[PDB]
Amino acid sequence: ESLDLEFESAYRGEVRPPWSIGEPQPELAALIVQGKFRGDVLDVGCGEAAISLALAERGHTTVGLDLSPAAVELARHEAAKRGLANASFEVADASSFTGYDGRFDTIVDSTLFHSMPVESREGYLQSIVRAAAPGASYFVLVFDRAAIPEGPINAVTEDELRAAVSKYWIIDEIKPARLYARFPAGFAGMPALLDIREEPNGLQSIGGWLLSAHLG
Template structure:
């Protein structure tokens, strides 16, 4: 099976089969997205969609940006709020809500960033998510999605994200957004060893994290 029916709050409570936090929560923004920050491509008021522990939100707030993180799981939201308070980051706020149906932010965001959320959604939730994000986007807003590519996980793995191929990603997002680019990318993960499950044979970064196959999609809402 894939992520349908997954209890994500138990994952963030670290009660699942994988020890520790989700492997793709690496204590800092994913390098693909950190590069966008350095390039000045994440600007204005930002939505961190499915923010998790909010590593991206916190990094942006440290640069003085206004960020809203929306996350389904109360454990992750509580951790994000605590981290922002401890760092004195008043421009980062966090909302517990369903990203596939959230409201209340019409045309608010200049940039929307999806850091490993898309593949965590049930397939039937994708369209609602993309519609909700479009409604929350200001005219001309930019949208970035970092998502696992098919082949990132062993086919025999019982529970895994809903990986995508390029055509599937383009079809889903292109119904609502104007796509500018889809390119191969990597999601860096602290993948633990688990009995009976081989560690994927992918390259590692300088910190020893596995670089798992992914796509980085860039899109925008017409002005």
């Protein structure tokens, strides 16, 4: 299976993607304020790249990679509107990319993890480790399989995520997390087929996992 056409259509606006919330995902913004993001950052499966933009505004040199040319164009457009010189973007397949050997001190996966086939995970993890500087940190925000079923999205259980990532990184923490979005009215039916939590500020959230890891 393949989500390439759906991601490109969502970014072109066929209304904006529900996950393009216009700010970094809150669970990842909390790690930034804790000082967990360091040096040159890779925002892998960056989408519109709100987290790249926030990190570039703080002084980091950032690179965002996405398979969708529309996402890369949107990220470049927003960085240009803000006059950021520090943020760059490229179209690439996270499961098979090169050209950044030992580059990044922090790699962040903001909901890319479940957006590729299960069979692509090993190529992706090999690609990002190859792109990592010594002592690099890695952060993943991903849907929980308890919340998102088998289907187009490859959400994970805690054990599955640990088994996949521990082969490549030293895992510091895996904890429950929320993935925020702005869904249209009536999203997923009435009654709803998914557990969508209503949040303040017109947002919603779905269950997930926040993983923190590093090289060492």
